[PDB]
Amino acid sequence: MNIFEMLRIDEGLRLKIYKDTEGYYTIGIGHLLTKSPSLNAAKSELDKAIGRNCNGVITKDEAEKLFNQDVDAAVRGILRNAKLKPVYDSLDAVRRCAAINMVFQMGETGVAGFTNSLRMLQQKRWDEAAVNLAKSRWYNQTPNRAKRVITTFRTGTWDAYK
Numbered sequence: 001m002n003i004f005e006m007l008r009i010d011e012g013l014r015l016k017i018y019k020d021t022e023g024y025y026t027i028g029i030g031h032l033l034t035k036s037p038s039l040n041a042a043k044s045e046l047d048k049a050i051g052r053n054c055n056g057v058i059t060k061d062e063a064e065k066l067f068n069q070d071v072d073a074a075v076r077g078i079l080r081n082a083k084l085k086p087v088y089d090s091l092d093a094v095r096r097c098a099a100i101n102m103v104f105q106m107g108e109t110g111v112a113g114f115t116n117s118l119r120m121l122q123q124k125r126w127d128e129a130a131v132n133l134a135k136s137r138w139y140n141q142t143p144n145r146a147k148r149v150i151t152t153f154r155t156g157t158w159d160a161y162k
């Protein structure tokens, strides 16, 4: 198991525009296109992302290209973030994957919330961090996925994905 296999489990693969768990137009392996309710706006974003006229449909190769870019972008965002980088650097490789997973799903908009979770993770207080992480809109709205990610932070193993 690695971050690509982990996020492929959590996000799936769909080759036509679909709505994500929040109702937002998405394609591929969890590639968010737009939060606008306009399907036309989403199709424009898709064409811009692929560099061709797609009318809402892509191939698996193209979905995987966006996926590689999106994982890369999540990592690079963690490393540029003054609050996230020290915690990320403090973690082992498996727990780093859990961190990338959360930033893939939610961007960096939830860093100020999760301040306390971040401190517990840096302190390696794993059971306490797991309790705090679950006290969240994230957990309530996507509980099965959050439970998998939280188990990964708690244990440093892939048990929740096997």
Ligand SMILES: Nc1ccc(CCCc2ccccc2)cc1
Pocket: 078, 084, 085, 087, 088, 098, 099, 100, 102, 103, 106, 107, 108, 109, 110, 111, 113, 114, 117, 118, 121
């Ligand atoms: N949006 C959002 C972004 C970040 C978090 C913090 C938990 C994940 C993480 C843990 C360690 C290092 C980097 C990221 C929560 C919400």
